[PDB]
Amino acid sequence: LNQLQSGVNRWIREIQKVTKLDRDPASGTALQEISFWLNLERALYRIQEKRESPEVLLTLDILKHGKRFHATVSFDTDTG
């Protein structure tokens, strides 16, 4: 359970690295803007597809069954 907890912590930190990305509007070209926004959208969709995979759902289910609600609630909420 502790190993799964630390793994979910790593997952949450990695997801927050991508979800919290923000671009300064003033800097760079609008071409860079469109590239940034589409790349971010593709990354989020890939992350979402990974998140719905049976592995992550199984991990969350194991953590719930062990009453380790820290990681599960954080993953459901902190990721944004």
Partner: protein
């Protein structure tokens, strides 16, 4: 920025403190201040004129006890300052107060002066970075991992039912009654005097509390148990003398389900629960009855769950499914919830900043507590 927030559940009976992330409250200890009543004569005596936490416990006989907060309101603020300072002592949490944020859990419908003075004490005396008053029911639901339910938290000093549905609390449905475990222990002391054992002294009162812990059960039928003969379980005092309880064993906790016994015309615990649910809207009632979460130390009485189920079944509408969920860690549920909530980065948005409090004062904390 800061490294880690500190969760402090300042329950009237026991104060439970630890760091956010820890699965168990690392440092939980009784919520009273003990001062020596006798005279010091021989050098090399116990140091200090104030005793808190375990050190008071090993030397309980020497000390006069003083509870700082009674029914969830801090009557003595200097003592509460001292115990909060003890929470940061080298014994517990061994860290500076100005470095870590703090989450504090207060009882619902408490006086406004209580929360504002509390925020004052944390922000001036301790110079904490950020503070967040919180409701115990929300944390209990977080710890159980539920967004719905009715939290019936019966701590030492106060009992209260809060209905929460899908992360929304109905504030007008929150029922609070001051009858709680400490009142049960007072009633038990009175009955033990009636049986012929006196515990007038302050330190002795903790013995009455331990008696309540060890040998007290809630009968399914109080009257049928009353007419029948008791078992008269004996309890050994710390010195060695025994005391025989008998009929007071079950008549004591029945104070919770009938406050008429002490003489207070207040709602019973089952009445608190059913009134809280019924006071809500119709559509949710069934789901609320399907989800009942028990918290607080007073819920650990033997037979509490079954008696409560019988009472709510009698008072609830017929053919309704009642399911009372009693986790194993009821006593430390609220702190675990506080830890979970603090661990969330969203906590960064709820708490009040020291600069914000200084700029706005009590208005800021009053806004960001409800």
């Amino acid at each position: 920025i800061a490294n880690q927030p500190v969760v402090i559940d300042n329950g009237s009976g026991v104060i439970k403190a630890g760091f956010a992330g820890d699965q168990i409250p690392k440092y939980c200890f009784p919520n009273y201040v003990g001062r020596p009543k006798h005279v010091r004569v021989m050098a090399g005596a116990l140091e200090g004129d104030i005793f808190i936490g375990p050190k008071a416990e090993e030397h309980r006989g020497l000390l006069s006890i003083r509870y700082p907060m009674e029914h969830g309101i801090v009557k003595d603020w200097n003592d509460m300052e001292r115990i909060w300072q003890y929470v940061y002592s080298k014994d517990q949490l061994q860290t500076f107060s100005e470095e870590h944020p703090v989450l504090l859990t207060e009882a619902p419908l408490n006086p406004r002066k209580n929360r504002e003075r509390a925020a004052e004490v944390f922000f001036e005396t301790f110079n904490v970075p950020a503070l967040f008053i919180s409701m115990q029911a929300v944390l209990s639901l977080y710890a159980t991992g539920r967004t719905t339910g009715v939290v019936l938290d019966s701590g030492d000093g106060v009992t209260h039912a809060v209905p929460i549905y899908e992360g929304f609390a109905m504030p007008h449905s929150i029922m609070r009654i001051d009858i709680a475990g400490r009142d049960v222990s007072r009633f038990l002391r009175l009955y033990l005097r009636k049986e012929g054992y006196d515990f007038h002294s302050s330190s002795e009162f903790e013995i009455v509390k331990a008696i309540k812990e060890r040998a007290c059960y809630l009968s399914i039928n109080p009257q049928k148990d009353e007419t029948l003969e008791t078992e008269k379980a004996q309890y050994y005092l710390p010195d060695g003398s025994t005391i025989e309880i008998g009929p007071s064993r079950f008549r004591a906790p029945e104070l919770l389900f009938r406050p008429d016994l002490i003489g207070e015309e207040s709602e019973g615990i089952h009445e608190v629960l059913v009134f809280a649910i019924q006071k809500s809207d119709m559509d949710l009632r069934r789901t609320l009855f399907s989800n009942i979460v028990l918290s607080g130390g007073s819920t650990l009485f033997k037979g509490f769950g079954d008696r409560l189920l019988s009472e709510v079944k009698k008072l609830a509408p017929k053919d309704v499914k009642i399911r009372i969920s009693a986790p194993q860690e009821r006593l430390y549920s609220t702190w675990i919830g506080g830890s979970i909530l603090a661990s969330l980065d969203t906590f960064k948005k709820m708490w009040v900043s020291k600069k914000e409090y200084e700029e706005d004062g009590a208005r800021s904390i009053h806004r960001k507590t409800f």
